Amino acid sequence: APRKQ
């Protein structure tokens, strides 16, 4: 759960 993808 990266903020970016």
Added chain:
Amino acid sequence: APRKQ
């Protein structure tokens, strides 16, 4: 060629 149809 009636104006209406």
Added chain:
Amino acid sequence: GTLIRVTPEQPTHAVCVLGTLTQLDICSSAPTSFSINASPGVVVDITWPLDPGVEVTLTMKAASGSTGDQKVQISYYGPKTPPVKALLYLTAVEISLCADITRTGKQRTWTWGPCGQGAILLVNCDRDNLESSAMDCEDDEVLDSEDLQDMSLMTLSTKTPKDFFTNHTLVLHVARSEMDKVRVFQATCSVVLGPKWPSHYLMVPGGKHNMDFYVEALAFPDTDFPGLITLTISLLDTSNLELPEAVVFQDSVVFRVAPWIMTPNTQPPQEVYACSIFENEDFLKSVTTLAMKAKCKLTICPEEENMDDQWMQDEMEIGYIQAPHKTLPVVFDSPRNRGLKEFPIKRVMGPDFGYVTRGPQTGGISGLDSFGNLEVSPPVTVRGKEYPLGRILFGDSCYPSNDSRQMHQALQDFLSAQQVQAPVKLYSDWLSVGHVDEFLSFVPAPDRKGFRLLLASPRSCYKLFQEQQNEGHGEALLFEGIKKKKQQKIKNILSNKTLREHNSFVERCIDWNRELLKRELGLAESDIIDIPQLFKLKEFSKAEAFFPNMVNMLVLGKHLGIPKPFGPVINGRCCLEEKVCSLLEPLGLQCTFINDFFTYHIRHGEVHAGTNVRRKPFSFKWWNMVP
């Protein structure tokens, strides 16, 4: 306006609606002079020559009790000519289509501002319906009595003779261009007007009658919809079975559909959101503590609903809609559609909680559509122009290229069509994630304008570390207190010339926005606080926080949830926390530093990014603005 043609051959019959202008044409069908005599109920303002420029206007005081119960006799005459009469039989009626046009208390133009006029219509986008999924405005029924509280009252007041609707009929209508945006119900509820029904014959008894309608809007102002809806009543003469109906009178009400409005960090918080049911509970303890301190409801989205999506900031923005009769919160659901996809629809939409969404929902989206990239300034006056609900702020690139991102145009256009918070594009695309909340925040302040703009500032942090080194602490360790991390000394941070180059470029990106915000929000330096913050460039030279991004904070009135930076410990305390405290405590702000390192920071976001907040709507009424 109406011009009645009177004739000595035939008596004429006519209806007069009170409040309308009625003139007579005396000349066109005359047989040298004329006089006029009328019954007491008719006031005739205008003995006279039979000349075309003689304006004869009739006014009627009250509604007729019987048809033709008022009369006008025009007697024509001449030197050698005994009088010739023409008869006009009048029936007066009252036809008032009424709405809350003064905006407190239930021309044909909608005007903005405190001296303006025009009724307000809410988009009926919540769900009062008990165990349902749809927004209330999706069907053509009023299913709950409380749903009507969201709708706008319109009333038709009529006063006629007992037999008037024998030969006349009233029709209520909406233009086909607008019928898809409104639905109108008649109360005693059943639909009279709506998406496939632009007109409806009203069933109205003679004498005095009052008919209430309830109106819901079905769409927000947008590119394709300025936000105005006109409903019209027409009185039709149906006296002749061998002729079409003839319009006698029309009147209208113009409604404006209430815009979607956002709330800045300076608005008092009401409810905090986190979906902190995933791996870690101490983060969640801290925000829960802050919510309590701030007197807020607290709602949490569990792992089973999260799908491991922890970015509560990004999938939604809680705004509101506002009318004189009703104000409700409304969630704008971002198209980003990750694990939190269902949360706005299933958990946030409900009774007195509206819903809106925009943009493509199965692709065609970027990171700048995440609502960490959607914020709003406090109220601001810019070179005389007042923005009493602030200005929406969202991040962009400085120019469009093959490798640049933007928020989807459908979102941009929807925000600008809610004219009320006149959006300002900022430059966020230099960031990896790409969100304005990565470099700015606003906090309340007791003095000067009532807020401070906080900006992330590499300058401030280099200054801090340099002073610390100058005072003999060059050995002090950034990342003291972290399990699994390369500790780094102040001296080595300062001597790193590539890190300095990176942060110099970032400083330049932030300074561009500083001046942009200064122009567009009318700010002076005294409105702005720099928060010490280092960055680094990584993939595609995109910027990321070097240590926990402190500007990405949760603002709960005077209570702040600031990411714990884990800075060099000097005289028993992290000098970064210390610096931030020295900047914010003088404003009355209380700074809580929250460990988010391995749960948020490491995954490219901080406290603001992991939370969301519903805040109190502005007291100032949007319709009193002049956009």
Added chain:
Amino acid sequence: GTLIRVTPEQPTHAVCVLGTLTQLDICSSAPTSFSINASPGVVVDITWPLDPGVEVTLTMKAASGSTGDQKVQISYYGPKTPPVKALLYLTAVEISLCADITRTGKQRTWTWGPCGQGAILLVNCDRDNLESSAMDCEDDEVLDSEDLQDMSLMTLSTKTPKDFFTNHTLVLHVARSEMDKVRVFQATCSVVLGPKWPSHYLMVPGGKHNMDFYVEALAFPDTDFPGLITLTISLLDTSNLELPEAVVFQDSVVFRVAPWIMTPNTQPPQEVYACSIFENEDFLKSVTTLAMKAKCKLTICPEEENMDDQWMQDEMEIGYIQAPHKTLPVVFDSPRNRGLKEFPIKRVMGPDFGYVTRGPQTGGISGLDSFGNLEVSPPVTVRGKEYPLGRILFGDSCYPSNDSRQMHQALQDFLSAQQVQAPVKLYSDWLSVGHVDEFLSFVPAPDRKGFRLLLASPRSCYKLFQEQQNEGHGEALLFEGIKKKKQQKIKNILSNKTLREHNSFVERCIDWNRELLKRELGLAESDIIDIPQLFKLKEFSKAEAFFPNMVNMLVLGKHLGIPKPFGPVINGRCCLEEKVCSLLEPLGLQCTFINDFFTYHIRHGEVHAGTNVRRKPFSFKWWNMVP
């Protein structure tokens, strides 16, 4: 605005664009007081305390000859402290993006009116291309040197050091939301910006350089397009091979796309259209005679192209577009798409003759989309509000029902988006055909406002026939002179109570429009002439002309081509012609009565319906209006 941070540790380098505001931050990185010394080319307005509220602004007089050829030395000092210098090396440049913003002679806001500002852009919708079919703006090439006459000139003037673009680059760009509406060519032509190219790196040499661009618009203002196009130049610092490009400066030009504008009957005629190559040649002789009298070009569409479609009025409307550099006529091609379908595209569009169309092209259309239902008033001032190009007029129903017609919404929205002639809906749907030209026309007049509104009037004709009967001519025959027609006596016309009922209802429909036109166009009775005209109701109680509809006339300055009514002949002359002459001749109008009976009248149209006219554009410039 730019804020340069100066430092005693490192000398700073910066570019300054002339006309920009440059401030220094002296305090943030200072080591009690300071002084400033600069080279003659720098004007420093602001000896001084080292206090944060000291505003230091730098101004540069001319462009630099070499990079860093201007200097600023800030010497800091104190009681016991020998001076410490900080160095700032400045390079001044000129970057002017120029357009015709004063609207005669080649802020960042487009404002309306004589004191306003903003350049104009034409939709490049004609076809200068020699033997081609497409509009010129459909490809991405300038194919003819004269095409450039339609385009707007924009110039980039730059003055820099000889080596400046070693480390800086200029980019020209348009927002992705607008790139589909504009195309920009660089001249020495090749496209730099357009539908798939929102940005382009300019190749610019150091020193002094001037680069011309030519800009064409690709779309008219519409529901989805307010009509503004912004083109921006950005100066980028590309000095660092290990860092992304950084924006140093942006400037913009805002263009407004010129609206489509119609011409009233009071505008002098330039060209007459008829497609009178079908069965009959004497009609055509008369209009040809009138065109000659009126000094007009005359163009005729032959039977082979007609497909027996004789209604030249209905398939098109000739308007124009206007900029300070170029004005051209533009045909709006109606979606009605009958026999004349190809005429606008093949015969009217061409060199310096533009094209536009709207609405669905293979169905979904009504009779009210025929352009006999599209007209425009003369210039008019309505309760103080000036409409210097008049107001568009088109016919509608009074309310939407299952059996009512309207002009297609796409057409309506396009007309209103050309804000300039603020459309007014009239009520034409009571007519079988359904066109405003069946009950109104405008003619020039030498006095009072400069025109008369003519309205068809059953009242006038009953009055005429009654007077004739009163004078002993009750036996006189309507339709004297017609081969195959039931002749009818004045006495029997008058005694026909059903005909009277029909014309009474029609009078009511026309009177509704009279008052509507009075309100919306600010007319008094003295602006209006009633033309004697009978009607009858037929299929669906829809109105048709009882005898040739004289209001459906061709207006060629003072020369009028009026349908020959074939009215009762009294003292050697048709009393209808006589009545019309008595009404119009006092205005200086010459009335020619044209036999159209078996060719037009019998097929539900008259002279106006069988012809079209291109008229001179208004001298008044649309951009000087305040809509």
